[PDB]
């Protein structure tokens with residue numbers, strides 16, 4: 001039933017828990033594989049089943065995820081705020097299985113199908129931005145950090161009209177803040193995390209900003225190789241991290257010298273070796289507007305919306321979380337409202 005690496009040996013056509021008729025294979029991650037099934041007990045209703053790897057630590061992550069899903073699902077009984085619905089859980093041959101509403105595509109896979117370095121229609125990005133901000137609102141009302149928002153953890157329905165935030169395996173209550181510089185997938189990781197400053201709901205807003213750029217361009221906004229590189233790429237957009245913010249950072253000495261100069265680590269072209277370059281200034285060079293427009297000819301209505309997305313991204317991607325746009329302000333933004 002279980003392979004050497006602890007994954008359940010999915011067979012298409014098999015029944016799980018004497019009720020879930022497995023007809024489709026959806027994918028495999030680090031922590032699980034996911035199938036499509038019909039519920040024999042509920043008029044053959046379509047479900048997704050996530051089968052956690054037979055591993056103590058990963059099973060415990062799965063039980064943690066059940067707790068956060070129950071809290072979010074119970075807090076949103078009419079399902080208005082775009083978080084994945086858990087129906088129930090069961091055990092099958094010692095595997096923890098979570099039964100979800102039937103979604104089978106994440107926004108990474110959508111980007112891969114609908115182009116390469118292409119991106120989605122600006123009308124779709126508008127709609128998806130509103131739905132993501134509604135998810136942030138519920139998270140905040142529930143005092144929850146998702147702490148891993150990225151295209152891979154956003155699911156879409158068949159018609160790709162509705163998205164749901166998924167995978168609460170990295171989630172926490174806002175109080176118990178592990179001072180770790182590795183919270184959130186690196187590309188989507190806010191600068192307050194990296195420098196070791198106090199963080200909150202702002203890390204999820206940051207991650208959504210990174211996601212929205214990627215949804216329209218088809219390109220990762222900040223493809224940094226390390227934490228130091230991530231800061232350089234952030235500061236290429238906004239300029240040097242403010243002095244007040246640097247001095248608060250528990251990890252400031254990994255990134256900045258005594259005079260608050262940035263210590264940029266570069267892998268030398270010639271040698272495969274790291275070197276350091278001290279920079280007192282980082283001049284903003286990241287041209288967001290030019291990035292979003294792909295040297296492409298748009299109708300003026302779409303051109304208006306891309307400028308508005310750019311303004312919204314400028315307000316999301318403030319380095320200081322205290323200066324970052326609120327969920328309320330984001331929902332009321334011209335990009336979504338006009």
Ligand SMILES: NC(=O)c1cc2c(-c3ccc(C(=O)NCc4ccccc4N)s3)cccc2s1
Nearest residue numbers: 027028034048050100103104105106109166167
């Ligand atoms: N992480 C989670 O908690 C959940 C994921 C899902 C899904 C999934 C949607 C798509 C998934 C996926 O892994 N595709 C990537 C992939 C894997 C292997 C080979 C190719 C690709 N593209 S999993 C669906 C329903 C519920 C949950 S909960």
